[PDB]
Every structure is written in structure tokens, then in C-alpha cells.
Design a protein around this motif. Structure first.
Motif, short mmCIF file in Angstrom:
data_model
loop_
_atom_site.label_atom_id
_atom_site.label_comp_id
_atom_site.label_asym_id
_atom_site.label_seq_id
_atom_site.Cartn_x
_atom_site.Cartn_y
_atom_site.Cartn_z
N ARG A 45 0.83 -1.23 0.00
CA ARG A 45 0.00 0.00 0.00
C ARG A 45 0.86 1.27 0.00
NH1 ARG A 45 -4.59 3.27 3.48
NH2 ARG A 45 -6.15 3.23 1.75
N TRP A 48 1.93 1.99 -3.52
CA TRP A 48 0.80 2.55 -4.31
C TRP A 48 0.45 3.98 -3.97
CZ3 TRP A 48 -3.58 4.23 -6.63
CH2 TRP A 48 -4.79 4.31 -5.95
N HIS A 172 -6.24 -6.02 -3.05
CA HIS A 172 -7.08 -6.08 -1.87
C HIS A 172 -7.29 -7.53 -1.36
CE1 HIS A 172 -8.95 -1.72 -1.94
NE2 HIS A 172 -7.67 -1.75 -1.55
N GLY A 175 -3.82 -8.17 3.47
CA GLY A 175 -3.97 -7.38 4.68
C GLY A 175 -5.42 -7.21 5.09
N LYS A 176 -5.79 -6.01 5.54
CA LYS A 176 -7.17 -5.79 6.03
C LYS A 176 -7.48 -4.29 6.11
CE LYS A 176 -8.09 -6.58 10.52
NZ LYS A 176 -8.41 -5.22 11.04
N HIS A 178 -8.82 -1.40 8.73
CA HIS A 178 -8.71 -1.14 10.16
C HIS A 178 -9.59 0.05 10.55
CE1 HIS A 178 -4.79 -2.76 8.67
NE2 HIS A 178 -4.64 -3.43 9.81
N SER A 182 -9.26 4.23 8.81
CA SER A 182 -10.01 4.81 7.70
C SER A 182 -11.52 4.86 7.93
CB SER A 182 -9.71 4.06 6.40
OG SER A 182 -10.05 2.69 6.51
C1 HEM Z 1 -10.70 2.87 -5.75
C2 HEM Z 1 -9.39 2.54 -5.28
C3 HEM Z 1 -9.05 2.13 -3.93
C4 HEM Z 1 -9.64 2.48 -2.75
C5 HEM Z 1 -10.83 3.41 -2.50
C6 HEM Z 1 -8.91 1.84 -1.69
C7 HEM Z 1 -9.21 1.89 -0.33
C8 HEM Z 1 -8.59 1.18 0.72
C9 HEM Z 1 -8.93 1.28 2.12
C10 HEM Z 1 -10.04 2.15 2.72
C11 HEM Z 1 -8.03 0.47 2.78
C12 HEM Z 1 -7.98 0.14 4.25
C13 HEM Z 1 -6.96 1.05 4.98
C14 HEM Z 1 -6.93 0.63 6.44
O1 HEM Z 1 -7.97 0.79 7.17
O2 HEM Z 1 -5.87 0.14 6.91
C15 HEM Z 1 -7.16 -0.14 1.82
C16 HEM Z 1 -6.17 -1.07 2.14
C17 HEM Z 1 -5.27 -1.61 1.19
N1 HEM Z 1 -5.22 -1.23 -0.15
FE1 HEM Z 1 -6.48 -0.03 -1.16
N2 HEM Z 1 -7.85 1.09 -2.21
C18 HEM Z 1 -7.89 1.26 -3.59
C19 HEM Z 1 -6.94 0.81 -4.50
C20 HEM Z 1 -5.79 0.05 -4.15
C21 HEM Z 1 -4.75 -0.29 -5.09
C22 HEM Z 1 -4.79 0.24 -6.53
C23 HEM Z 1 -3.80 -1.00 -4.40
C24 HEM Z 1 -2.50 -1.48 -4.83
C25 HEM Z 1 -2.25 -2.05 -6.07
C26 HEM Z 1 -4.26 -1.10 -3.03
C27 HEM Z 1 -3.65 -1.84 -2.01
C28 HEM Z 1 -4.11 -1.93 -0.66
C29 HEM Z 1 -3.55 -2.81 0.37
C30 HEM Z 1 -2.40 -3.78 0.08
C31 HEM Z 1 -4.28 -2.62 1.52
C32 HEM Z 1 -4.09 -3.28 2.88
C33 HEM Z 1 -3.19 -2.44 3.80
C34 HEM Z 1 -2.95 -3.07 5.16
O3 HEM Z 1 -3.36 -4.22 5.49
O4 HEM Z 1 -2.28 -2.37 6.01
N3 HEM Z 1 -5.50 -0.42 -2.87
N4 HEM Z 1 -7.51 0.32 0.54
#
Ligand code: HEM
Length: 291
Positions: A45, A48, A172, A175-176, A178, A182
Motif C-alpha cells: 500500500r 501505491w 485487496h 492485509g485488512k 482497520h 479509515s
Molecule cells: C478505488 C481505489 C481504492 C480504494 C478506495 C482503496 C481503499 C482502501 C482502504 C479504505 C483500505 C484500508 C486502509 C486501512 O484501514 O488500513 C485499503 C487497504 C489496502 N489497499 Fe487499497 N484502495 C484502492 C486501491 C488500491 C490499489 C490500486 C492498491 C494497490 C495495487 C491497493 C492496495 C491496498 C492494500 C495492500 C491494503 C491493505 C493495507 C494493510 O493491510 O495495512 N488499494 N484500501
């Protein structure tokens, strides 16, 4: 403004494989983080979000300048929790002070995908640190409470088409969400530190219910204990996205290949590579090296 890639002086593939390896060995060692999820997902993340501030119209933001190190960007509300990935990388940067910040944040993401058994991601060096006044303002990263029309329009600014968007969203699996970070809570599936096409399978096969979480936001929930954001769910409400979701649910190798291309592209928007720059590097995993 043109951002020309400039190789760190005298460095070659072996130097960057040493940085890869140090990242990968710390990923293995520091296994307790986030209830034993480990740092893989938050490093993906971080890569990205440091790349996704880009604007194709004027070449502002993007991975080149490594501007996350400045307070306006590390304190973006959209970046809440990414400080854990930055702290992970600190001892790496101390050991290898010659690497640029943009090169280290993007390489962290590549290394995490590969060590979690994902596709190979070719990676190019040459990002150069730029000054504090080049940091993009907050508000360039996407909202999660929106529909497919929002998602499609959003990603046009990053020069991504429908296939590229649906492929990138497969991260997605990892991970998760939290609640305090957010306003959403829960994992998207069972294999959340191994890179697979599970995100697409769960979208199509779980029985989803629209519920409110304890922050009063709507999300989709299953009896298995998984969740989807409204923007995730939009990928099966829009008929163009739905076709692509079904393709990746039914072909793991195709998902791997399309993810690799789109993720490299994301990490390289805004950068001009001279005609005589080195070819992209493909790093060996620890397992492939016997380490
Ligand atoms: C419309 C596009 C997207 C939205 C609205 C979005 C939104 C979110 C949200 C709200 C979280 C949770 C954050 C938290 O509470 O820790 C999240 C986690 C994550 N997102 Fe996205 N995301 C999008 C696109 C992407 C893309 C393009 C990637 C990478 C290629 C990505 C990779 C991740 C990863 C790996 C996590 C987990 C992080 C963790 O476990 O700490 N996301 N995303």
C-alpha cells in the motif's frame, strides 16, 4: 516539468538485489506485526499511495520525488497507518543510504509482492529526491464510499483503463481494513499475506450483506468474516468491470501477468527513462537464492 531517471552513481543490479534481500529478510523476521499478518500488505500500500498522487495533466505528484518523507504528505488522512511501512524501511535506508527515497518506497512494494509468492514485477532505478515544495497537496487518493463511475473517472487521471483498474484492485486480497485507520473494518479473505486471485473469487462466490460498521459507514460483509468496500463491490455492479472480475477469478496466471504490468506502470508514471538507461531489473526471491 520533465523528470529524467538518473541512476544512483556507479550502482548496478547487484546493489539493488542486496537492498531487495535486506527488505525480504526483515519481512521474514518481523512476523508479529498486525496480528501476525506481517508487513507485506502495508508495504504494497505504501508503494501505491506514494505513486498514486500523480496527475497526467501536469506531471505533478508521482513516485519520482519521494515526497512522502515530508509532513504534508505523511500526514495526509488518506495515508493513515502507512507510517508503519515507513518505520520498517528506516533501518534499510540507514544500511543503504545511497538509494533514493522514491526508489526505496517503490522497491518495498515489489519486494513484498514477490516474497508473498506473487508475480515477478520488473523494476527500474533512477528516481531522484525533489524538495519539500514539490510535495502534492492532500486529496489526490481515492474515496472508498463511491460507485463504479467514480472509480473509472478517478483512474483516468493515472492513465489507467478498465482492465488496469480491475487488475490493480486484486491487491485487496492482502492485509485488512482497520476501523481507526479509515472507517472500515475486516479482511477481504483468508489468505491475506499470500498473493493470490482470492479477491475476485470472494467477490463472486460469497453471500454479501450491506451492513453498517461501528464507524457508521456502509460495507459489504459475509458469514465467513470477510468484507468488501463500496468501491470493491462496484466491480461486480458495473457490467464492464464484472466481465474482467470473472476473467481473473478463472485464470490465476492471467491475473498475475496483468497485475505485474499495471503495477510497474503505476510505479513508473511521470518518469522519463533515457534511451540508454539500464533495462528493468527482475530480482530473485530469497527462496530462489537459497537464503
Ligand atoms: C478505488 C481505489 C481504492 C480504494 C478506495 C482503496 C481503499 C482502501 C482502504 C479504505 C483500505 C484500508 C486502509 C486501512 O484501514 O488500513 C485499503 C487497504 C489496502 N489497499 Fe487499497 N484502495 C484502492 C486501491 C488500491 C490499489 C490500486 C492498491 C494497490 C495495487 C491497493 C492496495 C491496498 C492494500 C495492500 C491494503 C491493505 C493495507 C494493510 O493491510 O495495512 N488499494 N484500501
Amino acid at each position: 516539468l520533465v523528470h529524467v531517471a538518473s541512476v544512483e552513481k556507479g550502482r548496478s543490479y547487484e546493489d539493488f538485489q542486496k537492498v531487495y534481500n535486506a527488505i525480504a529478510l526483515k519481512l521474514r523476521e518481523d512476523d508479529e506485526y498486525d496480528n501476525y499478518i506481517g508487513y507485506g500488505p502495508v508495504l504494497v500500500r505504501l508503494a501505491w499511495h506514494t505513486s498514486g498522487t500523480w496527475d497526467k495533466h501536469d506531471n505533478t505528484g508521482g513516485s519520482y520525488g519521494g515526497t512522502y518523507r515530508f509532513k504534508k504528505e505523511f500526514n495526509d488522512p488518506s495515508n493513515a497507518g502507512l507510517q508503519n511501512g515507513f518505520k520498517f524501511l528506516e533501518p534499510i535506508h540507514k544500511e543503504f543510504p545511497w538509494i533514493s527515497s522514491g526508489d526505496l518506497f517503490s522497491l518495498g512494494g515489489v519486494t513484498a509482492v514477490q516474497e508473498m509468492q506473487g508475480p515477478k514485477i520488473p523494476w527500474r532505478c533512477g528516481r531522484v529526491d525533489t524538495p519539500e515544495d514539490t510535495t502534492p497537496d492532500n486529496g489526490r487518493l481515492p474515496d472508498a464510499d463511491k460507485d463504479a463511475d467514480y472509480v473509472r473517472t478517478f483512474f483516468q487521471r493515472l492513465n489507467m483503463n478498465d482492465r488496469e483498474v480491475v487488475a490493480l484492485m486484486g491487491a485487496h486480497a492482502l492485509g485488512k481494513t482497520h476501523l481507526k485507520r479509515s472507517g472500515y473494518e475486516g479482511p477481504w479473505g483468508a489468505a491475506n499475506n499470500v498473493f493470490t486471485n482470492e479477491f475476485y473469487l470472494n467477490l463472486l462466490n460469497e453471500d454479501w450483506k450491506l451492513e453498517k460498521n461501528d464507524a457508521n459507514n456502509e460495507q459489504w460483509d459475509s458469514k465467513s468474516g470477510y468484507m468488501m468496500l463500496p468501491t470493491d463491490y462496484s466491480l461486480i455492479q458495473d457490467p464492464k468491470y464484472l466481465s474482467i472480475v470473472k476473467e481473473y477469478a478463472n485464470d490465476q496466471d492471467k491475473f498475475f501477468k496483468d497485475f505485474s504490468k499495471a503495477f510497474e506502470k503505476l510505479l513508473e508514471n511521470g518518469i522519463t527513462f533515457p534511451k540508454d538507461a539500464p533495462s528493468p531489473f527482475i530480482f530473485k526471491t530469497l527462496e530462489e537464492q537459497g537464503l
